[PDB]
């Protein structure tokens, strides 16, 4: 049985008037987006912030991820540059599918990803950078710090409300984190600390595939997760269990849990609503930035 893609989550293409600030816009789309857990926001075509990270000195040690670690029930983290990681990432994907990386359909990577997660005869290992502080490496967005030069054409993005460094983070301190992905690199089902909102921007690269569950089904997902989780992980606290909450979306959908999907492309935002469980994986070499915010 092949993977059945969940229905698509809402995609909003606001005009320049509606693109005023995220909090006011997110508040207006809330009646629909909170019923799907996640949503995608495409900025106007003329809104193109330049990549402001120091690519030359961007050196990181990615995490190692075995796709079928739960099904099977040694591996250690090589330092890459942003360019050397991309060469490895593209070589892996083109070799795996035996075709140019830009020719692999997104539905094929999705179908192959979920086959490998539950496959016991093929062990696929990938690498990714995650939770990289924008303070130590610089943000993908231009920032008024004096650390790097801001051109006059870039000041509008350093002051934009959609710049993740300008999101309100103080609940009635925190900085955005960076994520460098490759094909099959994934993140497990989780919600944010304090049931916070989260906003995610894909600066460049191949798409990031998301799955989302509305907050009204959070208890149902947790019950399905605990009923099907291994016996040794079923009783673990949520903060620790979320580190290994891998589950095919079709399994949740079979148990009545509503699940929505989307492919986040370069230059697009993804917002997850409070207590909306979400998971996903990367289609290929990409660079993302994320922050939890409060309304
Ligand atoms: C604000 C911080 C705490 C955060 C990050 C996320 C999240 O869910 N993200 C980030 C991008 C994507 N993760 C990946 O692509 C991983 C494989 C490399 C999903 N939520 N809050
Ligand atoms: Mn998240």
From Swiss-Prot:
2-oxoglutarate binds at residues 128, 198, 200, 208. Changing residue 184 to V: In NEDEHC; uncertain significance; decreased protein expression levels. Residues 9-50 form the JmjN domain. A motif (GSGFP motif) lies at residues 138-142. Residues 156-295 form the JmjC domain. It is found in: Nucleus, Nucleolus; Nucleus. Fe cation binds at residues 190, 192, 278. The GSGFP motif is required for the interaction with SUZ12. The ARID domain specifically binds to the CCGCCC motif and is required for the lysine-specific histone demethylase activity. The PHD-type 3 zinc finger is required for the interaction with histone H3 di- and trimethylated at 'Lys-4'. It is linked to A chromosomal aberration involving KDM5A has been found in M5 type acute myeloid leukemia. Translocation t(11;12)(p15;p13) with NUP98. Chromosomal aberrations involving KDM5A have been found in M7 type childhood acute myeloid leukemia. Translocation t(11;12)(p15;p13) with NUP98. Histone demethylase that specifically demethylates 'Lys-4' of histone H3, thereby playing a central role in histone code. Does not demethylate histone H3 'Lys-9', H3 'Lys-27', H3 'Lys-36', H3 'Lys-79' or H4 'Lys-20'. Demethylates trimethylated and dimethylated but not monomethylated H3 'Lys-4'. Regulates specific gene transcription through DNA-binding on 5'-CCGCCC-3' motif. May stimulate transcription mediated by nuclear receptors. Involved in transcriptional regulation of Hox proteins during cell differentiation. May participate in transcriptional repression of cytokines such as CXCL12. Belongs to the JARID1 histone demethylase family. Interacts with SUZ12; the interaction is direct. Interacts with the viral protein-binding domain of RB1. Interacts with ESR1, MYC, MYCN and LMO2. Interacts with HDAC1; this interaction impairs histone deacetylation by HDAC1. Interacts with BMAL1 and CLOCK. Interacts (via PHD-type 1 zinc finger) with histone H3 unmodified at 'Lys-4' and (via PHD-type 3 zinc finger) with histone H3 di- and trimethylated at 'Lys-4'. This is Lysine-specific demethylase 5A. It comes from Homo sapiens (Human).
């Amino acid at each position: 049985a092949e993977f059945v893609p969940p229905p698509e989550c809402p995609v909003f293409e606001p005009s320049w008037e509606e693109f005023t600030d995220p909090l006011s816009f997110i508040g207006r789309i809330r009646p629909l987006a909170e019923k799907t857990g996640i949503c995608k926001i495409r900025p106007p075509k003329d809104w193109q912030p330049p990549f402001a990270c120091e690519v030359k000195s961007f050196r990181f040690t990615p995490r190692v991820q075995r796709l079928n670690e739960l099904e099977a029930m040694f591996g250690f983290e090589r330092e890459y540059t942003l360019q050397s990681f991309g060469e490895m990432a593209d070589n892996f994907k083109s070799d795996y599918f035996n075709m140019p990386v830009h020719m692999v359909p997104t539905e094929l990577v999705e179908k192959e990803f979920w086959r490998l997660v539950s496959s016991i005869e093929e062990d696929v290992i990938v690498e990714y950078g995650a939770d990289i502080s924008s303070k130590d490496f610089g943000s993908g967005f231009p920032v008024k710090d004096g650390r790097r030069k801001i051109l006059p054409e870039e000041e509008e993005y350093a002051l934009s409300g959609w710049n993740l460094n300008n999101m309100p983070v103080l609940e009635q301190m925190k900085v955005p984190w960076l994520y460098v992905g490759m094909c099959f690199s994934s993140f497990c089902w989780h919600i944010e600390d304090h049931w916070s909102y989260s906003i995610n921007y894909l600066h460049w690269g191949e798409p990031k595939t998301w799955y989302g569950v509305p907050s009204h089904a959070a208890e149902q997902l947790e019950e399905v997760m605990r009923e099907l989780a291994p016996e040794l992980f079923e009783s673990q606290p949520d903060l620790l269990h979320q580190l290994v909450t891998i589950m095919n979306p079709n399994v949740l959908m079979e148990h009545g849990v509503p699940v929505y999907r989307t492919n986040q492309c370069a230059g697009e935002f993804v917002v997850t609503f409070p207590r909306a469980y979400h998971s996903g994986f990367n289609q290929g070499y990409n660079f993302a930035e994320a922050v939890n915010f409060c309304t």
